[model samples]
Target: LSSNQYQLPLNVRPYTTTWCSQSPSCSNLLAIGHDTGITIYCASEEQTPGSTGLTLQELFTIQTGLPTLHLSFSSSCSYSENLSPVYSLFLACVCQDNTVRLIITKNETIITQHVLGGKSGHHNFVNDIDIADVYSADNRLAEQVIASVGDDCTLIIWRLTDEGPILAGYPLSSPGISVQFRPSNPNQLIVGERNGNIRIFDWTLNLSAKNPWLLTLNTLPLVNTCHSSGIASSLANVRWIGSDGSGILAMCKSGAWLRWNLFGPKNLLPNVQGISLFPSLLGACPHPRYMDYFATAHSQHGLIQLINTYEKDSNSIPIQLGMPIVDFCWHQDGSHLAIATEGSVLLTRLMGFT
Candidate 1:
């Protein structure tokens, strides 16, 4: 373990949002939105684990200027084969009502802001957002694509082709709760809904349209038990495990953790992994690279807790956040950890990432 915890002030009061990462940058850039507005922040070069004469500092800030659509937990992924390792930050935020925004950044600078998945028939408020790039599947496209879930209970696909609309609209019912693309197969997507249902969708290139785009090819129900009836109302955060695409993990409204594996065919309820906590759990996110471990923020405890999903007990070695931890992040190298909440940001050297 190393000491590199830096506290950042957002110049605003009452930070009540989730923190997500896009780039695997050493400098650490972050973004989140609230009732006030959406803002982006960057961290300056700080002394590494054993370094001296340096400290982390806030470098820049900017407003997204979009209506407060529902914001999903931020996520990072690569769309291009040549996605550089030079530190890039990508953020996907859903407006509270019916609009969605995709933010991409490099070294704290906003590179592009693309508005997506809103047609006249589109519903207000995106329930969740997930990222997956399909350049390898259909090599014809030059840029990565995005998938978003909104008010309508539908899964929509968008792509950045050489030219044309980035296919920003889809019509689904009720609204999917969590959205993610299979890492190995970009054409196949895994989405979870409010009704405790999980579905898989296959994508097909449809050149028949005026703009030409990817369309849902087929649908299969994976599971309808994402949450237990006892914990049904408390579940909110849903994330895909880069460690195991077939796994499901979530936090309960009362601050419990649950995880199930997607094995065999759809319809079977997975072996349950649940941990009751002292504080109500607000956020539950797994390390993108490590499937066994996850970071969570509790409303009452005011700390970020890391749980080994495979671990059976509730109390574990959680990195302490003295000021109401809002969001937790593990760096690309998995060595550095960052926690974000309203008005404060903290960075600490993880045990293994040197």
Candidate 2:
């Protein structure tokens, strides 16, 4: 009910994670993962020019038959090298059953499904999933890849074809909690583990016949002398900040925010010290178009704040959502936001002035 914030009249089972499609063709669609299934919402109508509320229509929902843990979307651009609109949309869902499902769609209709990780897959919970493009000289989608990590202490890579998971790697230490591909480098991966450490892996180094898989590039710890206490000391999420992949943003389970520098003079280590801190960082997302500004959710206050990381400014303001925000996603145009909470979704339009 706050000024400039509009709530969408959509409801679903409570979930801690949600995703918004960034594809030029489907950015208006919001995806939510719940205890029994996934629901997709499309912003079908906007209020009159001077009207008050925007409208969202439910497009469809898919029952997963199991608890959905996490999900990611890969647009046509992600599967092709030429950026020639392929119009093929892919959704990867990691479920509590330790399996991953690939949902293929064309023009919003289900095309095919590929379930992974049955015989030799992880024996525990799958925590995160990410999609990355595999090199193909002919710009074919046969090489598109999806990576998933789990509480079983393993990372598995799968191709979009009938072939199952192709490569599997294990950490020498603890179970991994988060995994993401370097947007600019198809061969590099960034992983955050439960032991408060984040590591980088470059698969190109061990392409030899004997190795045949990925190898660690560098590892860095997120905790320091000032941050060496509390449950929040353990890493919760880690993400690369800019498309150039020069910096990383991480949040601990206790809600502290830390930044890392990836490109240094020497080693691949994010060994650089922390740059900034936030008291209750639930999640941090960089704006799709503005590199210097980003959004973050607060843990205790349930406030979503807009921050200008590039400079000090008085224009930064926090939007109060009145409930604990499980997760939030920014529309591709940077003007719309969709957030998930206990049982409902909130959609807001950003105004020029606060």
Candidate 3:
């Protein structure tokens, strides 16, 4: 019953990657990447419902030089020496100008920490990005690592520390589309390409066939009669669905999403037929708490669909934005959902994001 849209003032970036800050202090904030900057929005709870549930308010903004595409906030936390506790967290953003910007925010205040670019960065626009567990014990040093895919046909791994940046890269035959680190196994890195290609690089294995890598490549087959005689659809927004990175899910430019199981009893091919999603799904996220629940943004009259994996029925939600939904995400607790339309960002409460 509670959903509200906060009208934005500027041109919101199209197909923007939006996220709800998971930091404990700012967990209620919706972070959106726009044309000239990033803006953090807050939802006003406990407000009297006037047909709408909650209210939207602008908290603050950070200006930038280029349009931002994808943005991710780190799960690792930090603190400040101020009088009151000032919670801090890191953010990674890919921009239109082929640069990745690293930022630190303290109690909702923004600080530009570093830029990973120049000779080592992508020459074309960066398409997607993901930051692994920050300052991991996997490395004795206090540093953070992130990986990005780009239109430049390359995947670049960036290392950031107090001293400086170090980068490692691998080339792709076609333009890069998306990249994600498995939630269960942080060591497994999955990457997608414009050629309907999916590859996984295993970090747990130690060998030297070109650095002794456990690399596996699987391409999507054009199994749908609808795609008869056509090329494979490009994969986008790839995510790990089942336990231990065994089940893979991805969106195909075919206006549908598919699932793949890495290891099945009788499976030889990675591709397995799952239900196809919307004709135009702006974004989809698995519930952080309710593992079987999925929420998706739709371009079909600007709707939001809540899907239950076990039950197999989808509930369509609409706040009547009427424009294409550009982005969507769930808060860390999964109790709230944040969505972005052409001119506004909406926040709503879920029945059991619990």
Q: Of the candidates shown, which would achieve the greatest TM-score relative to the real structure?
A: 3
Local accuracy by lDDT, each model: 0.54, 0.63, 0.66
lDDT of 1 by residue, 1-354 (tens): 444554444454324333344433322444445544545444445455363222345444445544444443333423232544333555566654466667776544578877764464246556666665445445654556667765577667766656655564554544666676765566667665655445566666444542232322111122234543353453455655664366666554445555666545555344545554544344576776677777766655566666777674256644665556655566544555666655665566654434
> TM-scores of all models?
0.69, 0.78, 0.81
**Model 1: lowest-lDDT 10 consecutive positions:** 214-223
**lDDT per residue as tens, model 3, 89-206:** 6778876667888887665567556787766788787878888664456755466778898888998878776687767778877787888887667767888777777768664454
Cand. 2 TM to true fold: 0.78
Q: Residue 245 CA error for candidate 1 (Å)?
A: 2.9
For each of the candidates, the C-alpha root-mean-square deviation to the true structure, in angstroms, is 6.5, 5.2, 3.9
Which scores greater on TM-score, model 1 or model 2?
2
lDDT of 1: 0.54
Ranking by TM-score: 3, 2, 1
- Clashes per candidate (backbone, < 3 Å): 21, 1, 4
Candidate with better lDDT, 1 vs 2: 2
Task: Specify the poorest-scoring 10-residue window by lDDT in model 3.
Answer: 274-283
Clashing pairs in 3: 2-53, 207-212, 208-212, 209-212
Error of 3 at 326 (Å): 1.3
